[PDB]
Scaffold this motif. Structure first.
Motif, PDB file in Angstrom:
ATOM      1  N   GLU A 238       0.842  -1.193   0.000  1.00 35.64           N
ATOM      2  CA  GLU A 238       0.000   0.000   0.000  1.00 35.64           C
ATOM      3  C   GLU A 238       0.876   1.241   0.000  1.00 35.64           C
ATOM      4  OE1 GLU A 238      -3.080  -0.334  -0.578  1.00 35.64           O
ATOM      5  OE2 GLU A 238      -3.582  -2.307   0.243  1.00 35.64           O
ATOM      6  N   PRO A 239       0.350   2.373  -0.480  1.00 37.21           N
ATOM      7  CA  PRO A 239       1.103   3.629  -0.432  1.00 37.21           C
ATOM      8  C   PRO A 239       1.333   4.095   0.992  1.00 37.21           C
ATOM      9  CG  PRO A 239      -0.734   3.731  -1.994  1.00 37.21           C
ATOM     10  CD  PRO A 239      -0.975   2.573  -1.090  1.00 37.21           C
ATOM     11  N   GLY A 240       2.446   4.791   1.184  1.00 41.40           N
ATOM     12  CA  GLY A 240       2.694   5.465   2.448  1.00 41.40           C
ATOM     13  C   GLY A 240       4.149   5.834   2.620  1.00 41.40           C
ATOM     14  N   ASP A 241       4.408   6.971   3.275  1.00 40.63           N
ATOM     15  CA  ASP A 241       5.756   7.419   3.597  1.00 40.63           C
ATOM     16  C   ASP A 241       6.163   7.054   5.015  1.00 40.63           C
ATOM     17  OD1 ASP A 241       6.215   8.709   1.085  1.00 40.63           O
ATOM     18  OD2 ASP A 241       4.979  10.392   1.765  1.00 40.63           O
ATOM     19  N   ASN A 242       5.210   6.647   5.847  1.00 38.72           N
ATOM     20  CA  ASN A 242       5.472   6.316   7.240  1.00 38.72           C
ATOM     21  C   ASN A 242       4.554   5.168   7.615  1.00 38.72           C
ATOM     22  OD1 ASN A 242       4.425   6.853  10.316  1.00 38.72           O
ATOM     23  ND2 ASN A 242       6.644   7.153  10.079  1.00 38.72           N
ATOM     24  N   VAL A 243       5.027   4.282   8.483  1.00 39.32           N
ATOM     25  CA  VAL A 243       4.249   3.102   8.832  1.00 39.32           C
ATOM     26  C   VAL A 243       4.464   2.783  10.304  1.00 39.32           C
ATOM     27  CG1 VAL A 243       6.070   1.468   8.078  1.00 39.32           C
ATOM     28  CG2 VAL A 243       3.655   0.746   8.129  1.00 39.32           C
ATOM     29  N   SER A 244       3.381   2.407  10.979  1.00 37.13           N
ATOM     30  CA  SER A 244       3.468   1.807  12.302  1.00 37.13           C
ATOM     31  C   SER A 244       2.511   0.630  12.292  1.00 37.13           C
ATOM     32  CB  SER A 244       3.149   2.808  13.430  1.00 37.13           C
ATOM     33  OG  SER A 244       1.775   3.194  13.407  1.00 37.13           O
ATOM     34  N   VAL A 245       2.622  -0.236  13.300  1.00 36.19           N
ATOM     35  CA  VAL A 245       1.902  -1.500  13.273  1.00 36.19           C
ATOM     36  C   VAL A 245       1.652  -1.979  14.694  1.00 36.19           C
ATOM     37  CG1 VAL A 245       3.991  -2.988  13.170  1.00 36.19           C
ATOM     38  CG2 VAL A 245       1.790  -3.788  12.197  1.00 36.19           C
ATOM     39  N   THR A 246       0.532  -2.680  14.872  1.00 36.40           N
ATOM     40  CA  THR A 246       0.273  -3.445  16.085  1.00 36.40           C
ATOM     41  C   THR A 246      -0.523  -4.686  15.716  1.00 36.40           C
ATOM     42  OG1 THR A 246      -0.468  -3.270  18.422  1.00 36.40           O
ATOM     43  CG2 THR A 246      -1.870  -2.258  16.712  1.00 36.40           C
TER      44      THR A 246
ATOM     45  N   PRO B  57       4.558  17.908  23.017  1.00 28.68           N
ATOM     46  CA  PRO B  57       5.389  18.230  21.852  1.00 28.68           C
ATOM     47  C   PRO B  57       6.246  17.060  21.388  1.00 28.68           C
ATOM     48  CG  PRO B  57       6.202  19.378  23.836  1.00 28.68           C
ATOM     49  CD  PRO B  57       4.933  18.671  24.223  1.00 28.68           C
ATOM     50  N   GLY B  58       6.476  17.018  20.078  1.00 30.69           N
ATOM     51  CA  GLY B  58       7.384  16.024  19.544  1.00 30.69           C
ATOM     52  C   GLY B  58       7.346  15.907  18.040  1.00 30.69           C
ATOM     53  N   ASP B  59       8.488  15.570  17.454  1.00 38.09           N
ATOM     54  CA  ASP B  59       8.593  15.323  16.023  1.00 38.09           C
ATOM     55  C   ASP B  59       8.695  13.841  15.701  1.00 38.09           C
ATOM     56  OD1 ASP B  59       8.544  18.012  15.175  1.00 38.09           O
ATOM     57  OD2 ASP B  59      10.627  18.257  15.862  1.00 38.09           O
ATOM     58  N   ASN B  60       9.005  13.032  16.704  1.00 36.39           N
ATOM     59  CA  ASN B  60       9.153  11.593  16.583  1.00 36.39           C
ATOM     60  C   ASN B  60       8.463  10.932  17.761  1.00 36.39           C
ATOM     61  OD1 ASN B  60      11.093   8.955  17.261  1.00 36.39           O
ATOM     62  ND2 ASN B  60      10.598   9.272  15.073  1.00 36.39           N
ATOM     63  N   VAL B  61       7.873   9.769  17.529  1.00 34.13           N
ATOM     64  CA  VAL B  61       7.141   9.126  18.607  1.00 34.13           C
ATOM     65  C   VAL B  61       7.302   7.617  18.511  1.00 34.13           C
ATOM     66  CG1 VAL B  61       4.912   9.072  17.324  1.00 34.13           C
ATOM     67  CG2 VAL B  61       4.973   9.049  19.845  1.00 34.13           C
ATOM     68  N   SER B  62       7.548   6.978  19.655  1.00 34.53           N
ATOM     69  CA  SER B  62       7.414   5.532  19.750  1.00 34.53           C
ATOM     70  C   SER B  62       6.599   5.209  20.993  1.00 34.53           C
ATOM     71  CB  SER B  62       8.784   4.823  19.771  1.00 34.53           C
ATOM     72  OG  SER B  62       9.535   5.150  20.932  1.00 34.53           O
ATOM     73  N   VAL B  63       6.151   3.959  21.111  1.00 38.24           N
ATOM     74  CA  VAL B  63       5.256   3.605  22.207  1.00 38.24           C
ATOM     75  C   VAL B  63       5.404   2.127  22.540  1.00 38.24           C
ATOM     76  CG1 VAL B  63       3.359   3.171  20.617  1.00 38.24           C
ATOM     77  CG2 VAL B  63       2.864   3.672  23.012  1.00 38.24           C
TER      78      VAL B  63
ATOM     79  N   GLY C 299       4.580  12.263   5.693  1.00 38.54           N
ATOM     80  CA  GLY C 299       4.431  13.436   6.534  1.00 38.54           C
ATOM     81  C   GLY C 299       4.422  13.068   8.002  1.00 38.54           C
ATOM     82  N   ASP C 300       3.229  12.891   8.566  1.00 36.77           N
ATOM     83  CA  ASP C 300       3.121  12.572   9.985  1.00 36.77           C
ATOM     84  C   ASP C 300       3.834  11.272  10.296  1.00 36.77           C
ATOM     85  OD1 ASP C 300       1.458  14.748  10.006  1.00 36.77           O
ATOM     86  OD2 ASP C 300      -0.364  13.522   9.749  1.00 36.77           O
ATOM     87  N   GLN C 301       4.341  11.183  11.512  1.00 36.37           N
ATOM     88  CA  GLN C 301       4.865   9.940  12.058  1.00 36.37           C
ATOM     89  C   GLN C 301       3.871   9.334  13.026  1.00 36.37           C
ATOM     90  OE1 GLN C 301       8.408   9.665  14.478  1.00 36.37           O
ATOM     91  NE2 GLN C 301       7.933   7.481  14.641  1.00 36.37           N
ATOM     92  N   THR C 302       3.655   8.028  12.925  1.00 38.12           N
ATOM     93  CA  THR C 302       2.754   7.393  13.869  1.00 38.12           C
ATOM     94  C   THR C 302       3.459   6.293  14.657  1.00 38.12           C
ATOM     95  OG1 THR C 302       1.737   5.653  12.456  1.00 38.12           O
ATOM     96  CG2 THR C 302       0.883   7.941  12.227  1.00 38.12           C
ATOM     97  N   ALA C 303       2.856   5.962  15.793  1.00 40.43           N
ATOM     98  CA  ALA C 303       3.243   4.837  16.623  1.00 40.43           C
ATOM     99  C   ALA C 303       1.958   4.264  17.203  1.00 40.43           C
ATOM    100  CB  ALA C 303       4.222   5.260  17.729  1.00 40.43           C
ATOM    101  N   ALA C 304       1.906   2.937  17.340  1.00 40.53           N
ATOM    102  CA  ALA C 304       0.668   2.257  17.694  1.00 40.53           C
ATOM    103  C   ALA C 304       0.933   1.161  18.714  1.00 40.53           C
ATOM    104  CB  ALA C 304       0.001   1.647  16.451  1.00 40.53           C
ATOM    105  N   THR C 305      -0.030   0.956  19.608  1.00 39.36           N
ATOM    106  CA  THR C 305       0.030  -0.149  20.557  1.00 39.36           C
ATOM    107  C   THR C 305      -1.393  -0.625  20.802  1.00 39.36           C
ATOM    108  OG1 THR C 305       1.049  -0.919  22.637  1.00 39.36           O
ATOM    109  CG2 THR C 305      -0.132   1.200  22.691  1.00 39.36           C
ATOM    110  N   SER C 306      -1.526  -1.861  21.280  1.00 43.91           N
ATOM    111  CA  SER C 306      -2.841  -2.445  21.506  1.00 43.91           C
ATOM    112  C   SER C 306      -2.740  -3.428  22.660  1.00 43.91           C
ATOM    113  CB  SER C 306      -3.380  -3.168  20.261  1.00 43.91           C
ATOM    114  OG  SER C 306      -2.502  -4.207  19.878  1.00 43.91           O
ATOM    115  N   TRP C 307      -3.884  -3.706  23.279  1.00 45.70           N
ATOM    116  CA  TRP C 307      -3.934  -4.580  24.440  1.00 45.70           C
ATOM    117  C   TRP C 307      -5.306  -5.230  24.555  1.00 45.70           C
ATOM    118  CZ3 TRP C 307      -3.833   0.709  24.510  1.00 45.70           C
ATOM    119  CH2 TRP C 307      -4.900   1.381  25.123  1.00 45.70           C
ATOM    120  N   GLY C 308      -5.318  -6.431  25.127  1.00 47.06           N
ATOM    121  CA  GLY C 308      -6.548  -7.180  25.298  1.00 47.06           C
ATOM    122  C   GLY C 308      -6.954  -7.935  24.049  1.00 47.06           C
TER     123      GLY C 308
END
Ligand SMILES: CCN(CC)c1ccc2c(c1)Oc1cc(N(CC)CC)ccc1C2c1ccccc1C(=O)OCCOCCn1cc(CO[C@@H]2O[C@@H](C)[C@@H](O)[C@@H](O)[C@@H]2O)nn1
Ligand SMILES: CCN(CC)c1ccc2c(c1)Oc1cc(N(CC)CC)ccc1C2c1ccccc1C(=O)OCCOCCn1cc(CO[C@@H]2O[C@@H](C)[C@@H](O)[C@@H](O)[C@@H]2O)nn1
Ligand SMILES: CCN(CC)c1ccc2c(c1)Oc1cc(N(CC)CC)ccc1C2c1ccccc1C(=O)OCCOCCn1cc(CO[C@@H]2O[C@@H](C)[C@@H](O)[C@@H](O)[C@@H]2O)nn1
Length: 256
Positions: A42-50, A128-134, A87-96
């Motif tokens: 799929e298209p995209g410049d940034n990717v996160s996953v859970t 605030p932030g330009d980068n994110v992890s989780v 563009g935007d940076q994402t980070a993702a987490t999940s539970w249960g």
């Protein structure tokens, strides 16, 4: 350089590594028998996953971002389908159910969208932030969340433990975080100007970890067999991603 996101599951384990490269996200997969190219494309410049398991069946959510638009792609065993996430940076987490939390860095501001089994809504997190992890872990039914927000060369940890977001003890740069157990132990990987280093928490303060390898971008996944932790760090320079394995020293992995 490319940037990646990684998730893993099960006893083998299975690993899925997603790579954003030149506007396109592809997938490389491990099911114990060698790495192969998966069906996600799929298209995209940034990717996160859970991801989470229901019985023996994996469910995967991939967050693909172009400009300010993030599209959620769903694997529930019958092809990749477009999810309800808004563009935007994402980070993702999940539970249960599951519950999902997606953090988005956009023009210096990190915000949060949440899934609770009914609909998406805007969470309380604004920092605030330009980068994110989780990373996150359960203590019973209680979720604990750690968000690592980076601006320039400073990385700030934000803690959710059931009653608001508090600034953590942790001491733009690009990070990746994983955790395990109920203490928990945490490991935070930071790519800074060509090199990836490690900071670790085992319940009694932060300290420098042994991992030190080159790379412009980093993602991470980990699993427990009993009480033994196994960690996979994906370090990328250009279009080349090297896998680094912790299984008890750090060794070069089979990933290509
Ligand atoms: C899905 C197949 N089946 C048949 C065995 C099933 C399985 C589990 C549930 C099922 C049904 O129903 C419920 C219903 C509730 N209710 C009553 C309404 C709330 C109290 C609670 C638990 C279960 C649960 C449930 C109970 C315990 C643990 C997990 C679940 C669950 O998987 O949960 C699955 C529930 O899905 C139904 C609602 N839903 C699911 C989606 C899918 O959305 C996609 O996936 C989401 C996770 C997001 O990524 C979203 O953006 C994306 O579009 N949209 N609406
Ligand atoms: C001597 C220091 N004090 C008091 C001055 C102290 C000591 C132990 C606890 C204390 C407090 O509080 C709790 C609270 C809980 N609950 C109640 C249900 C959970 C809400 C449970 C056990 C204890 C515990 C506890 C009891 C027994 C065994 C372990 C713990 C524990 O380490 O648990 C952690 C509590 O703090 C002690 C050590 N600690 C925890 C942290 C949490 O730090 C955050 O979270 C970390 C994981 C990292 O993200 C870190 O960067 C971030 O700042 N920092 N130091
Ligand atoms: C029956 C005796 N033999 C063959 C004669 C044997 C068996 C296992 C190992 C053996 C040898 O050697 C090593 C050597 C290392 N080192 C030294 C630190 C570095 C290479 C480490 C572990 C073992 C392992 C090992 C230890 C623990 C778990 C798995 C393995 C393994 O590789 O094989 C067990 C079979 O499981 C399925 C096949 N498999 C598993 C893997 C592990 O692969 C790594 O881990 C995966 C999860 C991926 O991340 C992958 O990219 C990465 O390279 N490779 N092939």
């Amino acid at each position: 350089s490319v940037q990646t996101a990684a998730t893993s599951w099960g006893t083998v384990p299975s690993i899925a590594v997603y790579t954003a490269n030149n506007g396109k996200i592809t997938e490389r997969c491990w099911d114990g028998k060698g790495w192969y190219t998966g069906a996600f494309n799929e298209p995209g410049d940034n990717v996160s996953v859970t991801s989470w398991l229901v019985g023996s069946a994996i469910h995967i959510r991939v967050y693909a971002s172009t400009g300010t638009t993030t599209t959620e792609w769903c694997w529930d065993g019958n092809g990749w389908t477009k999810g309800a996430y808004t563009g935007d940076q994402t980070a993702a987490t999940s539970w249960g159910v599951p519950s999902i939390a997606v953090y988005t860095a956009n023009n210096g501001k990190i915000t949060e969208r949440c899934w609770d089994g009914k609909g998406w809504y805007t969470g309380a997190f604004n920092e605030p932030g330009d980068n994110v992890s989780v990373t996150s872990w359960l203590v019973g039914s209680a979720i604990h969340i750690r968000v690592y927000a980076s601006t320039g060369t400073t990385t700030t940890e934000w803690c959710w433990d059931g009653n608001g977001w508090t600034k953590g003890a942790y001491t733009g740069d690009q990070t990746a975080a994983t955790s395990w157990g109920t203490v928990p132990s945490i490991a935070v990987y930071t790519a800074n100007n060509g090199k990836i280093t490690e900071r670790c928490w085992d319940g009694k303060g932060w300290y420098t970890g042994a991992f030190n390898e080159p790379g412009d971008n980093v993602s991470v996944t980990s699993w427990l067999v009993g009480s033994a932790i196994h960690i996979r760090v994906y370090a990328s320079t250009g279009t080349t991603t090297t896998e680094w394995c912790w299984d008890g020293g750090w060794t070069k992995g089979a990933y290509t």
